Symmetry: C2
Subunit: 89 residues, 2 copies
């Protein structure tokens, strides 16, 4: 009952914040875990903000071209669509 | 082989950013995940930054008093000390 949306689920660009949301309004009081895995150059930054009504706005910053793995877990289980493949040109 | 350090592992105050570091320099190329579980009001913000050489800075922001659980995982296993109990006055 958790739903992710946004451009950052699939794309990011060097040096620019990529954004997506995770809507947990229809879920309970569990723990959200978000990470972006760069197997060579790590993700530079990731920010997860609760903006109200159990909507979370996520922004992350990548430094290098290539494929990254975006993981979004709710109670330690992948939300639908996770793990996501993120491509940086 | 991951080591976390800092006051933010055990102390946080409403409205004030709480910080710690996570040293993954002696670990491999696995994935790092950080969560702050409030049984009630969610964590407002969590910011994770790779500061270089596989050291990471973490800052988080809470909006209500109470007991929180801070989770730091490396390849989906808890790092030593995780889960951390954080009591906000």
């Amino acid at each position: 009952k958790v739903v992710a949306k946004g451009l950052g689920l699939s794309k990011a660009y060097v040096g620019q914040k990529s954004s997506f949301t995770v809507d947990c309004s229809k879920a309970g009081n569990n723990m959200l875990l978000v990470g972006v895995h760069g197997p060579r150059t790590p993700c530079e930054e990731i920010l997860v903000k609760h903006v109200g009504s159990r909507l979370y706005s996520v922004s992350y910053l990548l430094k290098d071209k290539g494929e990254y793995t975006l993981v979004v877990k709710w109670g330690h289980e992948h939300i639908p669509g996770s793990p996501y493949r993120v491509v940086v040109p």
